[PDB]
Structures are given as C-alpha cells and as structure tokens.
Amino acid sequence: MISLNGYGRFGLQYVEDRGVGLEDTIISSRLRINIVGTTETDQGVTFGAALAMQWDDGDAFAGTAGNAAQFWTSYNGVTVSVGNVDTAFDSVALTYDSEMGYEASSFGDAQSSFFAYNSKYDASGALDNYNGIAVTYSISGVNLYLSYVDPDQTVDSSLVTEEFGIAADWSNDMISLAAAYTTDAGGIVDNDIAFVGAAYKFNDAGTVGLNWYDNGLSTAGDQVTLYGNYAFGATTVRAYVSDIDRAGADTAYGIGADYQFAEGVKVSGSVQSGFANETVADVGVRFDF
Amino acid sequence: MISLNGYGRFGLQYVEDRGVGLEDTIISSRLRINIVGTTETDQGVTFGAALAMQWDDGDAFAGTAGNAAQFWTSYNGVTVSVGNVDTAFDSVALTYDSEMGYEASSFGDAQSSFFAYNSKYDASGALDNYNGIAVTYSISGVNLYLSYVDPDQTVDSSLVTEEFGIAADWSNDMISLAAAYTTDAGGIVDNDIAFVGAAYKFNDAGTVGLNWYDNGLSTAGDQVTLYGNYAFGATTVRAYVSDIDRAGADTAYGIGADYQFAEGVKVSGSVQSGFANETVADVGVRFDF
Amino acid sequence: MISLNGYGRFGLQYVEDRGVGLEDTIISSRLRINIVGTTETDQGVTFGAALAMQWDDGDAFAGTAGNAAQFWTSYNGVTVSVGNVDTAFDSVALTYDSEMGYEASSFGDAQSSFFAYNSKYDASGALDNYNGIAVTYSISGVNLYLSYVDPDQTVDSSLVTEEFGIAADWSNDMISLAAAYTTDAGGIVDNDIAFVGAAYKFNDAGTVGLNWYDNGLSTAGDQVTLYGNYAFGATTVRAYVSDIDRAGADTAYGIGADYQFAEGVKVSGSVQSGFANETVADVGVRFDF
Numbered sequence: 063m064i065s066l067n068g069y070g071r072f073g074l075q076y077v078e079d080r081g082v083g084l085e086d087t088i089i090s091s092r093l094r095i096n097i098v099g100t101t102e103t104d105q106g107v108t109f110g111a112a113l114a115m116q117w118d119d120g121d122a123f124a125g126t127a128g129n130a131a132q133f134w135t136s137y138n139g140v141t142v143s144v145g146n147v148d149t150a151f152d153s154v155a156l157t158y159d160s161e162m163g164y165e166a167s168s169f170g171d172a173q174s175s176f177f178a179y180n181s182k183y184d185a186s187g188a189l190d191n192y193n194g195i196a197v198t199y200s201i202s203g204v205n206l207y208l209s210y211v212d213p214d215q216t217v218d219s220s221l222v223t224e225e226f227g228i229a230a231d232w233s234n235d236m237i238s239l240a241a242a243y244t245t246d247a248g249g250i251v252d253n254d255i256a257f258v259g260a261a262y263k264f265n266d267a268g269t270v271g272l273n274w275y276d277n278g279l280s281t282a283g284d285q286v287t288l289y290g291n292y293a294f295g296a297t298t299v300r301a302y303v304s305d306i307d308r309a310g311a312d313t314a315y316g317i318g319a320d321y322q323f324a325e326g327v328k329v330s331g332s333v334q335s336g337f338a339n340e341t342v343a344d345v346g347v348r349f350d351f
Numbered sequence: 352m353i354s355l356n357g358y359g360r361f362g363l364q365y366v367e368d369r370g371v372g373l374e375d376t377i378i379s380s381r382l383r384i385n386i387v388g389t390t391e392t393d394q395g396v397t398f399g400a401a402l403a404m405q406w407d408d409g410d411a412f413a414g415t416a417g418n419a420a421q422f423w424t425s426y427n428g429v430t431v432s433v434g435n436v437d438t439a440f441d442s443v444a445l446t447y448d449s450e451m452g453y454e455a456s457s458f459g460d461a462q463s464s465f466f467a468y469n470s471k472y473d474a475s476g477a478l479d480n481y482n483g484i485a486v487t488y489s490i491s492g493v494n495l496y497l498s499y500v501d502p503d504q505t506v507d508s509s510l511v512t513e514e515f516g517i518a519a520d521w522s523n524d525m526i527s528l529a530a531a532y533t534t535d536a537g538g539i540v541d542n543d544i545a546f547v548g549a550a551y552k553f554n555d556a557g558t559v560g561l562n563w564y565d566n567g568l569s570t571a572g573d574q575v576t577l578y579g580n581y582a583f584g585a586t587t588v589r590a591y592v593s594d595i596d597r598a599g600a601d602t603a604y605g606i607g608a609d610y611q612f613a614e615g616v617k618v619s620g621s622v623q624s625g626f627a628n629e630t631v632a633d634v635g636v637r638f639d640f
Numbered sequence: 641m642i643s644l645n646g647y648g649r650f651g652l653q654y655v656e657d658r659g660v661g662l663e664d665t666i667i668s669s670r671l672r673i674n675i676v677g678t679t680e681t682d683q684g685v686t687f688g689a690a691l692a693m694q695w696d697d698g699d700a701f702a703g704t705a706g707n708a709a710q711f712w713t714s715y716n717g718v719t720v721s722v723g724n725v726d727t728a729f730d731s732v733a734l735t736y737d738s739e740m741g742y743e744a745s746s747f748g749d750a751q752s753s754f755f756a757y758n759s760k761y762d763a764s765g766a767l768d769n770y771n772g773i774a775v776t777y778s779i780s781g782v783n784l785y786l787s788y789v790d791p792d793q794t795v796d797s798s799l800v801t802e803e804f805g806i807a808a809d810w811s812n813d814m815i816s817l818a819a820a821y822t823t824d825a826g827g828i829v830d831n832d833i834a835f836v837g838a839a840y841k842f843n844d845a846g847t848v849g850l851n852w853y854d855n856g857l858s859t860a861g862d863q864v865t866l867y868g869n870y871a872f873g874a875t876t877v878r879a880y881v882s883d884i885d886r887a888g889a890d891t892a893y894g895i896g897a898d899y900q901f902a903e904g905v906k907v908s909g910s911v912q913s914g915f916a917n918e919t920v921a922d923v924g925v926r927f928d929f
C-alpha cells in the first residue's frame with residue numbers, strides 16, 4: 063500500500079536588519095510531501111519505507127527532489143528503523159515544545175549540533191554513505207529511543223566518529239518528564255550533549271515547562287529554557303525565555319499565538335529576540351493534507 | 352487530501368534543415384505529473400499546494416525532478432496564489448487559441464518575453480528567489496487576473512525589476528473578448544506588452560478569432576494573428592495566419608487537425624511555416640490520466 | 641488514472657576484502673517507487689506512461705530523482721513502447737533465473753554489455769537523447785520481443801551505432817525455452833550477443849535449467865550457467881555453477897535460500913564465489929507495496 067501526506071505553509075518572515083541591500087521581510091514558504099510504502103502481514107509484523115520531497119523558498123535550482131530513504135519493521139510496540147533515521151535527541155518529547163510562530167522556531171531550542179532525520183538531499187556529498195539504525199519502544203505512557211548513526215558506513219569504523227544516542231520520556235495526565243543523552247553528537251569527537259525536561263499541565267488549558275541542556279562543544283554552553291502556553295478556545299498563547307552560559311549573551315525570549323482556523327489549518331505568528339539581540343517575527347498559515 | 356493527475360504525449364516532430372549533422376525528424380515526447388495537496392474547511396476556504404514533475408525528450412541528465420511550489424487560498428470565487436504562480440498574460444483566455452498539433456504550438460502565439468508558471472527547475476540559479484503573488488476573480492462569464500512577480504525577493508525591491516500584469520476576459524455563447532497588459536514583462540525594464548483578442552463562435556461547430564499584440568521590446572514588433580477552427584464530428588480542423596512588424600519577415604501560417612479518439616485521448620498533427628520561413632510539422636498523441 | 645507501487649529491501653552485504661580501509665560488510669538497501677499513468681479507452685486501446693524513482697545506498701547527494709519516461713500503447717496482446725524501453729535481451733524469460741539472495745544477483749547472469757531499462761538519471765549526460773522503440777507480442781505461452789535503441793536520436797543515424805534486439809520464449813507446464821539475439825549491443829560496433837536457455841520443472845516443487853551465452857566482445861567469452869531450485873513449503877533453495885571461456889577464470893558458484901514470510905515479504909540470503917575468486921554474501925528482506 064502507498065500513502066501520501068504532507069503540509070504546506072506560507073507567510074511573512076521578518077528579520078531585523080537582515081543584511082546590506084537585503085529585504086528584511088520576505089515571503090517564506092515550504093511544501094512537504096511524504097511518500098510512505100507499507101506492507102502489513104498476518105503475523106503482525108509491518109514493513110515500511112518512506113521518502114520525503116520538500117521544497118523551501120530560496121532552494122537552489124528552484125526544484126524539488128526526494129531525500130534518502132528510511133526503512134522500518136514494527137512488531138508489538140517495537141520499531142527498528144534503518145537508513146535515514148530519526149535520532150533519540152531529536153525524537154524525545156518536550157525538547158521542542160517552546161517553538162512558536164508558523165515556522166515553528168525558538169531560540170529556546172537546544173543550541174547544539176547533532177544528527178537528525180535529513181529532510182533533503184545534500185549537495186556537498188557529506189551524506190552519501192550516511193546510515194543509521196534506530197530502535198523505539200513504547201510501553202504505555204513510556205517511550206524509549208535508541209539511535210546509532212555512522213556518517214560513512216563504507217569506511218572502516220575505527221576511522222570515523224559514530225553517534226550514539228539514548229532517550230526516554232514519560233507522561234501521565236498532568237506531568238511529563240524527558241531526558242536524552244548523546245555521545246559524539248553530529249559525528250564530532252567529544253561533543254557529548256544531554257537534555258532533561260519537565261512539564262506541568264496546570265489545567266486542561268495551560269502548560270508550563272522547563273528544559274535544561276548541556277550543549278557539549280557548542281559555544282553556547284549550558285542552557286535553560288522556561289516556556290508556557292495557554293489555550294483560550296481556538297487560540298493558543300505561547301511564550302518562552304531562554305538563557306545560555308556564553309559570556310555576554312542576552313536573554314532570549316519569544317511571544318506568539320496560534321489560531322486553529324479549522325481541522326488541519328493553523329494560523330500562527332510570533333515575535334522573538336535572540337541571544338545576540340537578533341529581532342525576528344513571522345505570521346503565516348500551515349495547512350495539512 | 353492529495354491528488355495526482357497528468358498527461359503523456361509522444362509523436363514525430365519534423366524541423367526542416369534542423370542543423371548540420373542533425374536528424375530533421377525526431378520522436379518528441381513529454382510526461383507531466385501534477386501533485387496537488389488540498390485542505391477544505393467547513394468555513395468554505397480551501398487551501399492548496401501544487402508541485403509538477405515534468406520530463407521532456409532531451410532533458411539534461413535523463414532525469415526528472417519537481418519544480419518550485421505554488422500555494423493558494425480560495426474563497427467565494429476569489430483565489431490568491433503565492434510562489435510559482437500563473438501570471439495574467441499567460442492565463443487570459445483566447446491568447447493561445449491558434450495553437451495546433453500534438454505539441455500545441457503556433458507562430459501566431461505572442462512573440463514577447465514574459466514570466467509564466469515555471470514547469471521545471473532552472474539549473475542557472477536564476478529562479479532561486481523568484482516569488483510571485485497572483486489574484487484571480489471569476490464573477491460569471493467574466494474573469495479578472497492580476498499578477499505581481501519579483502524575480503529575486505530577498506534583494507531590496509528598488510534594485511530589481513518586478514513584473515506587474517492585469518488581464519480580463521468575457522464570454523457569452525457566441526462572442527468572447529480578452530485583453531491583457533503587463534509592465535516590465537519578464538523583469539526587463541520598459542518591456543511593456545499588451546494583448547487584445549476577440550472570437551466569434553459562428554456555429555456550434557466553428558470559431559474564428561483575431562488576436563493583436565504589442566510585443567514590447569521584442570524585435571517582432573506588433574503582431575496580428577487570425578485563426579479559425581471547425582469541428583466535423585470527432586475531427587477538428589484548425590488554421591491560422593500571423594504577421595509581425597519586423598522588417599522582411601514572412602507571413603507565418605499553420606494548418607492542422609485533431610481527432611478525438613476517446614475521452615482523454617487526442618491524436619493531432621500540423622504543418623506550419625514561420626516568420627523566417629522555418630518549416631515544422633508534427634503528428635502524435637496526447638493522453639490524459 | 642495514476643497508480644503507485646514499489647518495493648523496499650534492506651540487509652547485510654558482505655564482500656570479502658572489499659578494499660584498503662573499507663568495511664567488508666555494509667547495510668545495503670534500495671527503495672523503488674513506480675508512478676504509472678494509464679488511460680483506458682472503450683475501443684480497447686490502453687495508453688500508459690511510467691516514471692521510476694529509485695534510491696540506493698551510496699547514491700550521490702543522498703537524494704532521489706525520477707528517471708526518463710517510458711510510454712506505451714497496448715491493443716489485443718500487442719504493446720508498442722517508446723522512450724526508456726525494456727529491451728529484448730533484458731526481457732526474455734529464463735536469462736536471470738539463477739539470481740539469488742536479497743539483491744537478486746548471480747555471477748551466472750550474462751557477462752556482456754547491452755542496453756536495458758534505465759532505472760535512474762545519468763549524471764554523465766550520456767542518456768540525454770537516448771530513445772528506444774520496443775514491440776512485444778504475447779500469443780499464449782509464446783512471447784515475442786523486439787527492441788531498437790538509438791543512443792542519441794538527434795544526430796544523423798549514420799553517425800551513431802544503434803542496438804537491435806530480438807527474443808522469444810515459450811513455455812508449457814514442464815518445459816520452457818528461450819532465445820535472444822542482439823546486434824551492436826550497448827551501442828558498441830560488432831558486440832553481437834546471443835542467448836539460448838532451457839528449463840525443466842522436474843516436479844511442482846523443483847526446476848533445473850541451463851543458459852548458454854555468446855558474450856560478444858566481452859573478455860568473458862562464451863558462458864554456460866547451470867542452475868536449479870527446490871521449494872520446501874515456504875522455503876526455496878537455489879544453486880548455480882557458471883563457467884566462462886576467459887583464460888584462467890575460476891568456476892563461479894552460488895548457494896542461497898528464500899523464505900516467503902508472508903504475501904509480499906521475502907527473506908533471502910546467498911553465498912557466492914566469482915570468476916576471479918571474489919567471495920560475496922548477503923542476507924536481507926524485500927517487501928512489496
């Protein structure tokens with residue numbers, strides 16, 4: 063069986079003083095199409111393969127191609143994936159929950175380098191023999207994630223730095239906890255990064271959380287992000303503040319809102335300020351199909 | 352929801368004295384696939400995104416890729432589109448009605464340069480930050496089209512030439528009228544082009560029309576195209592003559608026929624002669640799927 | 641109508657002493673998606689167009705694109721195809737029946753160069769004006785195949801070497817015969833290749849066959865491949881031995897097994913030894929969707 067799904071988004075993206083002779087406000091947009099092939103068996107083992115075709119404004123050649131494939135096998139709550147996998151640091155709950163605006167961005171997300179699903183081809187040639195293996199297990203409320211990524215599987219293993227990651231998250235109705243740890247993140251020796259997060263659903267309508275990170279070799283150093291959101295009917299208000307250890311950095315912060323126009327259609331905007339005083343704002347729509 | 356549609360065509364394309372050591376007759380073919388994602392809402396606002404994958408004989412690398420995305424939002428007869436848009440000069444009725452043969456070509460089409468939907472990627476890098484905005488409105492019988500195209504939206508607007516176009520068409524059962532005007536067509540300063548056309552359905556079976564163009568900076572100068580077609584059951588006969596102002600040009604003319612083999616299957620051919628005495632002929636089939 | 645189908649495969653591929661500083665065992669995988677557009681008519685003539693998108697581990701740029709299109713028209717058992725066609729030497733029955741393992745490979749397959757359906761784009765630019773024409777006819781039990789491939793159809797025909805091929809196969813319940821002949825195979829002057837094969841289904845469960853080849857200009861020379869397979873319920877055992885004329889070559893051989901896990905899911909492995917003593921092994925799964 064083959065299924066197709068995806069989303070489109072478009073809106074205005076403002077970057078204060080973007081560059082000499084550059085427009086500060088542009089129309090930023092993205093089209094993402096996922097092609098998923100699945101083979102179900104009467105034994106209860108499902109086999110699947112996925113490809114993504116993603117276009118973003120500014121992409122080279124004004125064209126769209128598929129990325130590298132991901133393959134998986136699922137049985138009884140357990141999923142093993144191979145190829146272009148999702149990694150543990152990128153898949154754990156809570157770590158991206160401060161994101162806002164129609165481009166789902168936040169200075170409060172981790173300021174470290176690590177491997178993650180590659181949405182597009184890479185013209186440099188760096189991903190040509192990249193291969194990962196990931197294992198996920200969802201007991202019930204609990205999620206366990208493991209990932210191993212070899213950036214160049216054809217070369218002897220001792221000559222290349224491989225990335226190993228582990229993560230887990232747990233949730234009930236009001237509290238959620240998550241933690242992740244990755245060694246040699248991004249294929250960089252000694253870039254060992256870690257995440258610990260917690261969130262409290264202080265009503266059916268609002269949630270407050272705190273994420274803490276060890277950003278490994280990044281110049282940001284350790285980081286803490288405090289965020290919260292509150293839903294008023296169809297509109298959600300979101301905010302966050304984040305601090306990093308880097309000397310002289312400003313406190314980053316963001317305020318935004320989402321409006322659920324209809325099932326699958328979300329109008330969102332945000333105004334944010336970064337660690338170097340960058341001022342960014344956006345307003346747009348995402349529609350799922 | 353995602354839908355796929357498209358068409359294939361293949362046949363023989365003859366170009367008299369094509370080139371030293373070149374074959375005059377080749378097998379010319381095209382495959383076009385459209386991927387359209389749409390999100391309908393109970394408020395009556397539809398959101399959509401489209402991608403095209405088009406291959407033509409002779410294409411570089413013997414491969415096929417997607418082009419740049421187009422996004423739209425539709426409500427009550429009004430459609431706003433962003434990204435890789437259809438432009439007013441290219442979307443107005445009547446302007447391409449002299450086309451014939453299985454490759455839908457005519458020397459009687461406008462001999463000017465203007466922006467239009469880009470079916471494929473562009474390896475030169477010229478379309479990488481190209482972004483347009485188009486608005487269409489269909490009252491009933493009346494169609495209004497507006498388009499604005501910025502060839503490089505990231506650079507300050509005063510440093511780049513933007514294209515602005517407007518068009519309208521009107522039809523009843525027997526008469527149709529259309530007009531279009533575009534300033535700085537194709538992003539070329541002072542290339543201001545215009546179109547005025549009219550057609551008369553002088554029976555349920557035949558139609559005669561006249562298109563007039565101001566080709567802006569083109570060397571062709573002003574142009575007039577007289578064309579007509581007549582349907583005899585499943586076969587349609589078409590013809591046209593066209594004249595341009597360029598000094599010494601020949602009168603161009605074409606004669607062709609279409610046969611409706613079945614719903615979605617059309618067999619067509621044509622013999623045409625250009626403004627420089629070029630002699631071209633074709634015969635092939637188009638099938639829609 | 642548009643349909644999508646395909647398959648994914650992944651497993652372990654071992655090549656003894658693959659190279660200095662290279663891993664002998666890698667995870668080898670492939671994703672193949674076929675996009676087929678078809679237009680059926682009430683006259684009984686079907687028109688179709690197909691595109692393939694195929695990704696393999698190690699592919700340049702870690703991306704996936706479509707190949708060049710194939711078009712066909714079918715009526716009463718007869719199929720005419722144009723563009724990126726299947727050729728007679730590659731489509732005849734029996735010639736690939738010694739293949740084994742999850743990558744469907746065999747040293748017993750013909751060791752000659754010939755044109756065949758091109759699954760992917762070609763970055764060298766060699767296939768840009770490649771165009772073929774193929775005709776197949778299936779009486780009942782009998783299959784006839786004809787193919788003509790011009791590697792560069794835009795250049796005068798006398799300046800380019802074209803490939804011409806013919807093949808036929810015949811089968812009843814127990815015996816099958818096949819033969820193919822191709823002149824100027826692969827667009828190489830005087831590379832004339834030939835195939836004769838026969839197989840005997842010596843039970844409902846087992847089959848033994850013999851393929852003989854004239855490999856044209858290849859250095860392998862003539863070749864003979866003896867193979868057989870036997871099914872025990874859901875598991876099939878396969879083996880082959882092959883000999884070529886090249887001076888000093890070793891006898892190649894292979895042993896493998898397939899397990900039909902479920903409809904559309906096959907687990908397969910093999911251990912093989914080549915003409916130069918290469919030792920290769922694999923084990924993996926293919927799933928169709």
Ligand SMILES: CCCCCCCCOCCOCCOCCOCCO
Binds near residue numbers: 122
């Ligand atoms: C095979 C799938 C298609 C992906 C191949 C695209 C190959 C493009 O690059 C060719 C080499 O030249 C380098 C191009 O510049 C960077 C392109 O990508 C970056 C922005 O999206």
Ligand SMILES: CCCCCCCCOCCOCCOCCOCCO
Binds near residue numbers: 076087345
């Ligand atoms: C041309 C530059 C402007 C483009 C930037 C768009 C910026 C728009 O505003 C950002 C969103 O800020 C609003 C959120 O806080 C209030 C939420 O309550 C409002 C409605 O639900």
Ligand SMILES: CCCCCCCCOCCOCCOCCOCCO
Binds near residue numbers: 410411416417474
């Ligand atoms: C990213 C989508 C795939 C589109 C990228 C193709 C990139 C090809 O070019 C790489 C740069 O080299 C120039 C190629 O020559 C012209 C190709 O296109 C023209 C005919 O269709």
Ligand SMILES: CCCCCCCCOCCOCCOCCOCCO
Binds near residue numbers: 363633
């Ligand atoms: C090898 C070069 C020949 C390839 C060119 C094909 C040219 C074929 O003819 C063009 C079509 O001309 C015919 C139209 O006018 C008559 C219409 O009535 C006929 C059937 O409905």
Ligand SMILES: CCCCCCCCOCCOCCOCCOCCO
Binds near residue numbers: 415416700705706763
């Ligand atoms: C137009 C469809 C996309 C196919 C175009 C890809 C173009 C890539 O090459 C650009 C020229 O540079 C040469 C690249 O190196 C070889 C790539 O392919 C080989 C392995 O799959």
Ligand SMILES: CCCCCCCCOCCOCCOCCOCCO
Binds near residue numbers: 653899921923
């Ligand atoms: C790390 C290198 C190992 C990876 C190579 C996998 C090789 C595995 O074995 C190849 C298949 O050989 C077995 C076939 O013959 C016996 C068949 O009966 C067995 C079950 O149906």
